[PDB]
């Protein structure tokens, strides 16, 4: 019947946007859903009809320029452990008189896995990124995560992680606890999961995506004459590239028929870019998904969320990866023939312009984009995700 579903995430657009429509659907079907979220995102999540349950997070918030995420994986996992340790008691208290029938959580929310186990309720991981295949432990986890860190920093990380887990009655190795959920819905296109053939289907179910108007974000109107709209965005975090943005202005400025929407983040000011020609507009934040329904090209850092939205609208990409997993994703995008990967250094005005002109006229990039878009249309929709979640509800 109508149950209590509690969703858990952090204040990061890439970890909240991919599941908003699913939360909205669960509310619409009559479930009472709470959304554990840091205060800066309360409004953003309240837009789904779920009630925000607030808690203080120590992770970098996207609104504050004084903060930034690290570029390396090991520092990020450090951040997630620290945040989890201080966030768990707050969330335990907040939910002490109302324990949900099911727990939904983004991959970053360790407290949700701990509270799920201590409560005895099911937990569903919602992954806005790729998941472990069978053989992940021997192919990447041991060679690239564990074996390169037999350091005092590594040993400290594991000692604190396992002390925290064992403090909470959990005996799993920290790495299986973090990287191997018992049940997960994968919100990315199968076409972009490495070794999708070897992903345990009894654990993971690809639901691809379904995106609706984030009407809260407002709209963007195509200006008159703008035949080819190109959006430039390096995301929410790794956005401090003023030299690259100036190269974008010089690649598309005054190009007849092209219009450039340049999203520069909040650590670069428009003044840093010089005089702007009439066909280029600059923002520190854009309604990105609305612009991707109208864009002919997307110059992206290849973050998972932006890539998902672009593929969902079948817009060709120039992938300029900035940090962490983006490089791998850029490579996959190029490996699928829907994007060109450029390093930030080599992204000069002339090569940006000729790469964009090439991508938008290439019939083969369009047909591989439509194929991926149809595959995503066929891994169910939001209603299949809500069905699988409801299926995890007990009696
Ligand atoms: O002007 C803008 C800029 C971005 N977005 C949206 O913001 C979300 C971000 O998507 P994604 O590109 O996947 O996230 P990023 O900001 O690129 O990356 C983060 O992903 C990791 C998750 O913790 C961390 O390393 C840091 O947050 C950072 O790397 C997407 O839904 C975009 O549509 C907008 O709506 N308007």
Query: Are 217 and 201 a contacting pair, CB within 8 Å?
Result: no
Beta strands in the chain (DSSP E): 4-8, 32-37, 51-54, 102-106, 123-127, 184-186, 204-206, 228-233, 258-263, 280-283, 297-300, 317-319, 339-341
How many angstroms does the Cα of residue 142 sit away from the middle of ligand 1?
28
Separation CA 104–CA 96 (nearest Å): 17
> For ligand 1, what atom is nearest to the CA of residue 18?
31
Cα torsion through 25, 31, 36, 42, rounded to 10: 60
Tokens standing for residue 96: 């002490």
45, 71 Cβ separation under 8 angstroms:
no
184 touches ligand 1 (CB under 6 Å): no
Torsion of CA 137, 140, 145, 149, to 10 degrees: 100
Long-range (24+ apart) CB contacts under 8 A made by 149-157 are: 149/74, 153/74, 154/74, 157/74, 157/77, 157/78, 157/81
CA within 13 Å, CB half, 107: 23
Query: If we measure between CA atoms, which residue out of 7, 12, 10 comes closest to residue 303?
Result: 12
Count other C-beta atoms under 10 Å from residue 43's C-beta. Answer: 11
The 3-state secondary structure of 69-122 reads CCCCHHHHHHHHHHHHHHHHHHHHHHCCCCCCCEEEEECCCHHHHHHHHHHCCC
Q: Verify whether ligand 1 is closer than 6 Å to residue 59 (CB atom).
A: no
Burial 293-332 (b: 16+ CB within 10 A, else e): ebbbbbbbbbbbbbbbbbbbbbbbbbbbbbbbebbebbbb
Decide whether any atom of ligand 1 lies within 6 Å of the 236 Cβ: yes
Closest residue (by CA) to atom 21 of ligand 1? 14
Other CB atoms closer than 10 Å to residue 75's CB: what's the count? 12
The residue whose two tokens read 């995506």 is 209
Q: What does 305-355 look like in DSSP terms, one character per residue?
A: HHHHHHHHHT--EEE---STTHHHHHHHHHHTTSEEE--TTT--HHHHHHH
Q: 171 by DSSP, 3-state: which? A: coil
CA of 210 to the centre of ligand 1 (A): 17
Output the CA torsion sign for 29, 30, 34, 39.
Answer: positive
Method: X-ray
Nearest CA to ligand 1 atom 1: 285
Please state, in angstroms and as integers, the Cα–Cα distance from residue 22 to each residue in 12, 54, 74, following that order: 17, 20, 31
Kindly give the distance from the C-alpha atom of residue 2 to the centroid of ligand 1, in angstroms, as a whole number.
33
333 contacts 308 by C-beta, under 8 angstroms: no
Residue 16 Cα, ligand 1 centroid: separation in angstroms?
Answer: 10
Decide if 193 contacts 206 (C-beta within 8 A).
yes
Measured distance CA(300)–CA(47) in Å, rounded: 27
State how far the Cα of 354 lies from the Cα of 317, in Å rounded to an integer: 13
Which one, of 187, 225, 221, lies nearest residue 204 by Cα?
187
- The residue with tokens 């295949």 is 133
Residues in binding site for UDP-alpha-D-glucose = 17, 236-237, 285-286, 301
The neighbouring-strand residues paired with 184 are 125, 204
CA gap 300, 339 in Å, rounded: 10
Pocket test for ligand 1, best of 303, 312, 326 (most atoms within 8 A of CB): 303
Distance of CA 163 from the midpoint of ligand 1 (Å):
32
Neighbouring residues of 274: CB distance < 8 A, sequence distance ≥ 6: 246, 249
Q: Say whether 32 sits in a helix, a strand or coil.
A: strand
Q: Whose CA is nearest to atom 13 of ligand 1?
A: 305
Resolution of this entry in Å?
2.4
Query: In degrees rounded to 5, what are phi and psi of residue 34?
Result: -105, 145
Distance in angstroms (rounded) separating the CA atoms of residues 360 and 355: 9
Enumerate the known binding-site residues.
17, 236-237, 285-286, 301
State both tokens at 85.
């340790």
- The torsion of the CA quartet 269, 270, 273, 279, rounded to 10 degrees, works out to 150
Backbone angles phi, psi at 8, to 5 degrees: -130, 125
> Could you give the CA distance from residue 329 to residue 303 in angstroms, rounded to a whole number?
8
Structure tokens at 278: 């009439």
- Structure-token pair, residue 281: 């507009």
- Residues with Cβ within 8 Å of residue 356, at least 6 apart in sequence: 230, 251, 252, 297, 299, 318
Q: Which of 301, 306, 325 to mutate to test the pocket of ligand 1 (most atoms within 8 A of CB)?
A: 306
């Amino acid at each position: 019947t109508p149950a209590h579903i509690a969703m858990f995430s952090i204040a990061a657009h890439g970890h909240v946007n991919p599941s908003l429509e699913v939360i909205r659907e669960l509310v619409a079907r009559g479930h009472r859903v709470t959304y554990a979220i840091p205060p800066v995102f309360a409004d953003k999540v309240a837009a789904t009809g779920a009630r925000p349950v607030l808690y203080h997070s120590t992770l970098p918030k996207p609104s504050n320029p004084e903060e930034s995420w690290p570029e390396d994986q090991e520092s990020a996992m450090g951040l997630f452990l620290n945040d989890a340790i201080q966030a768990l008691p707050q969330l335990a208290d907040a939910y002490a008189d109302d324990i949900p029938d099911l727990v939904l959580h983004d991959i970053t929310s360790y407290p949700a896995r701990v509270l799920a186990r201590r409560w005895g309720v099911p937990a569903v991981s919602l992954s806005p990124n790729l998941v472990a295949w069978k053989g992940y432990e021997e192919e990447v986890a041991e060679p690239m995560w564990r074996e390169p860190r037999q350091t005092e920093r590594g040993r400290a990380y594991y000692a604190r992680f396992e002390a925290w887990l064992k403090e909470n009655g959990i005996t799993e190795h920290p790495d299986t606890f973090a990287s191997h959920p018992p049940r997960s819905l994968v919100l990315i296109p199968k076409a972009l999961q490495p070794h999708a053939d070897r992903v345990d289907e009894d654990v993971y179910t690809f639901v691809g995506a379904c995106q609706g108007d984030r009407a809260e974000e407002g709209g963007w109107q195509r200006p008159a004459g703008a035949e080819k709209v190109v959006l430039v965005s390096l995301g929410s975090a790794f956005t401090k590239q003023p030299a690259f943005y100036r190269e974008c202005v010089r690649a598309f400025g005054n190009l007849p028929g092209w219009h450039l929407v340049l999203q520069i983040g909040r650590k670069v000011t428009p003044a840093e870019l010089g005089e702007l020609p009439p066909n280029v507009e600059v923002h520190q934040w854009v309604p990105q998904l609305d612009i991707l329904t109208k864009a002919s090209a997307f110059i992206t850092h290849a973050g998972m969320g932006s890539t998902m939205e672009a593929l969902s609208n079948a817009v060709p990409m120039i992938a300029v990866p900035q940090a962490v997993d983006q490089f791998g994703n850029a490579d996959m995008l190029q490996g699928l023939g829907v994007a060109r990967k450029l390093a930030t250094e080599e992204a000069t005005a002339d090569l940006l312009r000729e790469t964009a002109l090439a991508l938008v006229d290439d019939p083969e990039v369009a047909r591989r984009l439509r194929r991926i878009q149809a595959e995503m249309a066929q891994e169910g929709g939001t209603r299949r995700a809500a069905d699988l979640i409801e299926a995890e509800l007990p009696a």
